[PDB]
Design a protein around this motif. Sequence first.
Motif, PDB file in Angstrom:
ATOM      1  N   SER A  22       4.490  -4.674  -9.556  1.00 33.10           N
ATOM      2  CA  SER A  22       4.086  -4.073 -10.790  1.00 33.10           C
ATOM      3  C   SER A  22       3.587  -2.683 -10.399  1.00 33.10           C
TER       4      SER A  22
ATOM      5  N   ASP B 161       5.268 -15.100  -8.487  1.00 35.81           N
ATOM      6  CA  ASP B 161       6.326 -14.452  -8.679  1.00 35.81           C
ATOM      7  C   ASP B 161       6.798 -13.375  -7.672  1.00 35.81           C
TER       8      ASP B 161
ATOM      9  N   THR C 216       6.523 -10.308  -7.278  1.00 36.52           N
ATOM     10  CA  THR C 216       6.883  -9.062  -7.680  1.00 36.52           C
ATOM     11  C   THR C 216       5.883  -7.906  -7.864  1.00 36.52           C
TER      12      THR C 216
ATOM     13  N   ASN D  71       6.839  -2.943 -14.301  1.00 36.41           N
ATOM     14  CA  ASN D  71       6.615  -4.316 -14.332  1.00 36.41           C
ATOM     15  C   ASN D  71       7.569  -4.973 -13.306  1.00 36.41           C
ATOM     16  N   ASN D  72       6.800  -5.864 -12.598  1.00 34.58           N
ATOM     17  CA  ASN D  72       7.544  -7.089 -11.905  1.00 34.58           C
ATOM     18  C   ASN D  72       9.186  -6.505 -11.200  1.00 34.58           C
TER      19      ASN D  72
END
Lengths: 222, 209, 198, 277
Positions: free
Chosen positions: B173, B169, B171, B136-137
Amino acid sequence: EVQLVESGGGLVQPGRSLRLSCAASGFTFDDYAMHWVRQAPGKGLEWVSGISWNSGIGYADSVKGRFTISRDNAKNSLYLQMNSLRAEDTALYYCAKGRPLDRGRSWYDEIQQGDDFDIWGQGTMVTVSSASTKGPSVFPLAPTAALGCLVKDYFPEPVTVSWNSGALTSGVHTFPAVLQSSGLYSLSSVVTVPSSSLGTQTYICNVNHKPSNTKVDKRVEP
Amino acid sequence: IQMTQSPVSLSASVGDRVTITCRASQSISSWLAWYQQKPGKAPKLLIYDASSLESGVPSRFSGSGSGTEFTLTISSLQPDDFATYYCQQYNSYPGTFGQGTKVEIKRTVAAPSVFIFPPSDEQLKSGTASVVCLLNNFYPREAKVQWKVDNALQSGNSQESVTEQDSKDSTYSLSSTLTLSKADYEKHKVYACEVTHQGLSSPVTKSFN
Amino acid sequence: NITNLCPFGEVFNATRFASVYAWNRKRISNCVADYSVLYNSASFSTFKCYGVSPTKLNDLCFTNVYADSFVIRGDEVRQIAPGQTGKIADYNYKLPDDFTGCVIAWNSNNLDSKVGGNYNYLYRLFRKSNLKPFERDISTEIYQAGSTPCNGVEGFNCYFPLQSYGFQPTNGVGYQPYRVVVLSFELLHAPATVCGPK
Amino acid sequence: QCVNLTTRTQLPPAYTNSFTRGVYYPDKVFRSSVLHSTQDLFLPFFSNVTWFHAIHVSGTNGTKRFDNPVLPFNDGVYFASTEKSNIIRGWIFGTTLDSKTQSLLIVNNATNVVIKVCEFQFCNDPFLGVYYHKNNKSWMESEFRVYSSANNCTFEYVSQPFLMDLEGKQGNFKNLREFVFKNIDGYFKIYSKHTPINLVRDLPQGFSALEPLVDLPIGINITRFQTLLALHRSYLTPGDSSSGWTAGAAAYYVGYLQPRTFLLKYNENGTITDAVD
Ligand SMILES: *[C@@H]1O[C@H](CO)[C@@H](O[C@@H]2O[C@H](CO)[C@@H](O[C@@H]3O[C@H](CO)[C@@H](O)[C@H](O)[C@@H]3O)[C@H](O)[C@H]2NC(C)=O)[C@H](O)[C@H]1NC(C)=O
Ligand SMILES: *[C@@H]1O[C@H](CO)[C@@H](O[C@@H]2O[C@H](CO)[C@@H](O)[C@H](O)[C@H]2NC(C)=O)[C@H](O)[C@H]1NC(C)=O
Ligand SMILES: *[C@@H]1O[C@H](CO)[C@@H](O)[C@H](O)[C@H]1NC(C)=O
Ligand SMILES: *[C@@H]1O[C@H](CO)[C@@H](O)[C@H](O)[C@H]1NC(C)=O
């Protein structure tokens, strides 16, 4: 607007024929030299074929003959009769119009333009499959900490997954599908909730399989 | 002939001046067009003739070069431009386009949140079982994952996927999946996934029995 | 008076011509024509006027012309003659027996000839019914002849209707690609606009 | 691809007497100060010319008035307006006025006039859109709101604009964009001239014969035409179709024709004074 719309696109058996369309609008479709340009899934663009203001241009190397462009200026609808569709022709085909005014190009001037393809149609997706549409065998993913819903062996694209009927759009993760080597699709989705929310609140993953609408719902718990 | 960009991808935060260059397989005169293609939409026209401008674009784009090598640069930058970019050729139809370097502009190095997921009960009853490594992220897409059987790693039984930058965000994942059958799956006890990224000191592992 | 012309060169010199099966129909109107040079060129391997004659042609105004254009291997330009038979006539291009216009055809074995198989050029081969005057069967459903339709399968009784020419450079004289332009001079009831010089 | 713009005003348009206006020259043999008889389709002397209102702002701000009617094209028409601005962009002459039937179109873009015939897709309230391009304070003039297609069709022509933009900005004339559109023997012919007049509202006691702008080989039966405007796109607001509109206000006149014959008192430069019948 100066717009293109194409049709005749969907699941097709390998080698089975198909005929596209591109009911172009706005521009004098009677002038600019169209081209069918296919983008793979995710990968790059790629020229397949073109056709002059009157007719006739070459194709990609492995697509000659088995394809056949054509148009009809009297109707405003470019064509593409595709035959013996192989594995690779699975792609999204975009109608496109050449950049320059190809109404009466030069007879004899060393040019052979290749700065073209202004306007691209929305693109009419095309597959090559040997298995039929199938709803997903959805499974859950039991766990600040995250848990999810896997959707295995659905076919063919798309599927819409939601959580608690779209209750929580946080921690959302639309993990895009991958064609299995076996020729099948699958993907998953996941969401993070506080580990304090582990044994307190329980969540629901649901899928609708839009090609056939095989709606399924599930409750995920560790 | 061919027409291949020199970068393979790049991120460089908003308000930056960056270059993308495409080199040929032969003298392609000086005609070229540049395409930015947001994810899932219809590619767009940016520069024709490899230098000129067409009405319908902000002036921030720039193009130059000739012969075998050409360049497209963006000086003052906006959130939109985070998109894929493509060149092409003209010499002789067919005139192709080339690989296509991304632009996923955002730069704050992040660390993953790594998990491993076993199969559900009915999943196992499915004759075939799949298990998951989740990342994740983290930022950026530059990251590698490799699973692990009790002693060694897996390969040739794995399929992987990655999201896009989220609109807020940025990011990335990652999902990876190990899809075996009950026969092979049951042979073992522990299944692991180990990850490397710019955001970690030692590669991070998550396993389960 | 003379200021413009009809954009004749946009085909009489055009880079590629259509397959005859999908023969282009360039509609020409709203212009004038110095037809004589369109004839006095000494380059055409054929120029035959039917229902009209090259004499006094520059007096001829019309509501419009429908310059049909295509490519066929040299000899078979003979099927471009009203009331002729033949595969171009039978299945690709039907000139009405009561034709009123002219036909032009020249060699182009330097231009529209290339090794490797030019699938640029095509013509219909199997077809239920014979054609109609100035009708164009670009569509390409795969023909059937006997017991079964073809389902999209091509095999016996089941063949792709269009086949190519393949103007190889080493072709014989009778195999050469004549670019063909069929100037049908129509005078329905509208103003006559495509006039001659002066 | 357009807005059911007004759809709500229908109050009976008033009329007017065409005291003297809308005569042309049917030749190009040079003439002098001698009478000559002439037969053709004329707008009748002192016709009950039908004066219709475009944006007509007499009222509480409220309703933004506009009632463009689709008028037949009996045997040719004479179209006029006052129109202090430069909004009366063109016409869409036809019979069915969309696909599977031809029709004609005149429009303008302040640089040149563009004339087409086609099988269009005209919608009931068509109007071109003049909208801010976000550069220079200037604009573009998109017309996607007039039709969803103008395709599979023939004519094209471009000339110095039919509407000659002028230096008024003071206002007693509004420039009287005048035209006469007649389709006879397969030809469509445009006879007109622009007239700044020192009179306040209506057409004068004095007279000026038009001049033949152009003669065109369309050969399309014409029996209906609705005129067109290119509304000034209000600064972009939530509400882009059924929203603040009617940027600019005026009204336009229409008068039909019928066969008549008159002896005109010609003059040396190709001029017209008077006739009676
Ligand atoms: C298609 O393109 C060719 C190449 O430019 C054109 O060729 C030349 O065209 C001229 C008339 O357009 C032909 O007539 C010649 O005129 C010149 C001067 O007017 C004169 O010196 C010659 O004696 C002859 O009368 C000329 O033969 C021709 N030459 C060549 C090499 O093509 C051609 O005209 C174009 N076709 C059309 C329909 O525009
Ligand atoms: C007014 O209309 C004319 C006719 O279309 C426009 O001329 C064209 O403008 C475009 C814009 O770049 C050019 O690409 C075309 O080549 C022009 N046509 C020609 C040269 O025949 C003109 O731009 C329009 N102007 C305005 C202000 O609307
Ligand atoms: C326009 O399209 C119609 C069918 O959509 C066709 O019958 C006709 O031949 C085309 N051309 C004209 C000029 O109408
Ligand atoms: C106005 O709305 C009605 C409602 O269906 C529709 O029939 C009509 O075509 C519309 N008029 C337009 C879009 O000009």
